[PDB]
Amino acid sequence: ITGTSTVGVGRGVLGDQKNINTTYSTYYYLQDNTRGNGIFTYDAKYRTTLPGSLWADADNQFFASYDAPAVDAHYYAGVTYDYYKNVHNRLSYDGNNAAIRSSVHYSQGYNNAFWNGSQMVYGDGDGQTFIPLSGGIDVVAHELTHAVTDYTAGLIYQNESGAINEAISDIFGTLVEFYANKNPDWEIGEDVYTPGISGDSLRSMSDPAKYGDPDHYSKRYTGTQDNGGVHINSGIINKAAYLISQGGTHYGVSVVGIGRDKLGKIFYRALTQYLTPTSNFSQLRAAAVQSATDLYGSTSQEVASVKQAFDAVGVK
Numbered sequence: 480i481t482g483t484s485t486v487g488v489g490r491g492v493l494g495d496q497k498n499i500n501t502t503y504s505t506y507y508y509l510q511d512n513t514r515g516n517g518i519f520t521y522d523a524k525y526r527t528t529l530p531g532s533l534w535a536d537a538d539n540q541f542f543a544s545y546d547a548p549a550v551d552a553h554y555y556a557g558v559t560y561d562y563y564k565n566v567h568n569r570l571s572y573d574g575n576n577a578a579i580r581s582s583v584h585y586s587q588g589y590n591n592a593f594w595n596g597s598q599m600v601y602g603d604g605d606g607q608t609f610i611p612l613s614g615g616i617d618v619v620a621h622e623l624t625h626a627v628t629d630y631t632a633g634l635i636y637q638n639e640s641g642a643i644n645e646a647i648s649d650i651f652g653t654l655v656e657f658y659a660n661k662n663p664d665w666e667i668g669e670d671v672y673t674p675g676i677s678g679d680s681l682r683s684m685s686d687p688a689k690y691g692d693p694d695h696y697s698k699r700y701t702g703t704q705d706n707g708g709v710h711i712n713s714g715i716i717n718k719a720a721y722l723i724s725q726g727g728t729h730y731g732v733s734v735v736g737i738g739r740d741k742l743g744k745i746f747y748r749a750l751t752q753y754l755t756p757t758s759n760f761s762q763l764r765a766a767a768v769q770s771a772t773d774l775y776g777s778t779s780q781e782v783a784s785v786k787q788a789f790d791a792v793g794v795k
């Protein structure tokens with residue numbers, strides 16, 4: 480909408496206070512004009528018609544329980560935008576400052592979030608498996624990263640390409656979480672997963688097997704559930720990415736860690752310059768090796784570490 484840029488204040492899903500960029504025209508709307516061609520957050524009002532209504536508020540204060548998922552979707556989309564712009568020189572998900580749209584309060588008791596091809600969508604959870612999912616910065620960045628993938632590599636959402644698609648979202652979700660630097664870890668969704676259980680998460684990148692996800696190619700799922708295991712086999716690539724950054728010895732194979740920033744550079748370059756819609760794990764290895772070669776040189780530690788990490792997870 481046309482209006483003047485304003486700054487509201489509110490509380491997120493976890494009860495933390497934050498400022499948010501809004502737009503005033505009669506109402507204060509969740510429309511952040513400070514980033515690209517805007518970040519827009521919508522109310523789906525417990526239904527499934529999208530996007531719903533652009534979030535309108537009378538006083539620019541967002542402290543109601545109903546406001547919390549909107550506050551976080553809006554704010555964390557901003558953080559994710561900043562990560563891609565500041566770290567990778569990428570302007571929004573399409574590289575041309577496309578407007579970023581999110582809807583919250585999608586459906587009832589909805590234990591998921593997704594990119595629908597045009598926008599991000601967040602359930603409120605059922606209060607047992609999840610609380611409102613936009614409360615997780617890694618979750619928000621995971622969803623926006625699907626848009627980035629779709630505009631770049633275009634990894635088909637099934638089987639190996641789909642598992643790479645998923646891992647890319649977990650990897651950049653985590654790198655965004657570290658970028659914001661509030662309780663960062665290599666776990667996925669811990670802030671909004673199972674409020675009755677402390678210390679767990681939806682997935683782990685550092686040890687995918689803690690939740691039964693594979694950490695080696697020999698343990699890959701080959702069935703048909705979950706689009707051929709896209710949220711399962713992602714563990715193999717998540718583990719490789721974790722090893723590249725942090726190092727470790729895994730099934731007897733030692734990896735020299737090179738840090739998060741270099742992991743991000745290598746995977747961003749792979750995603751945007753080398754991967755294609757049908758890339759498999761072996762092709763991802765080749766893309767990461769080539770990307771590290773471009774950035775750091777063929778004889779570099781970075782290239783050696785990429786090879787070690789894929790060796791460790793059984794991907795040749």
Ligand SMILES: CCNC(=O)[C@H](CC(C)C)NP(=O)(O)CNC(=O)OCc1ccccc1
Binds near residue numbers: 590618636710
């Ligand atoms: C429970 C499994 N879900 C996830 O892993 C994350 C949310 C996590 C990070 C909390 N959500 P996601 O991977 O974006 C869900 N994917 C998904 O719904 O894709 C199917 C689809 C495909 C095309 C259009 C719309 C939906």
Ligand SMILES: [Ca+2]
Binds near residue numbers: 536541
């Ligand atoms: Ca208000």
Ligand SMILES: [Ca+2]
Binds near residue numbers: 656661662664669670
């Ligand atoms: Ca965390």
Ligand SMILES: [Ca+2]
Binds near residue numbers: 666
């Ligand atoms: Ca996390």
Ligand SMILES: [Ca+2]
Binds near residue numbers: 669675680
């Ligand atoms: Ca939990």
Ligand SMILES: [Zn+2]
Binds near residue numbers: 621645
């Ligand atoms: Zn995903």
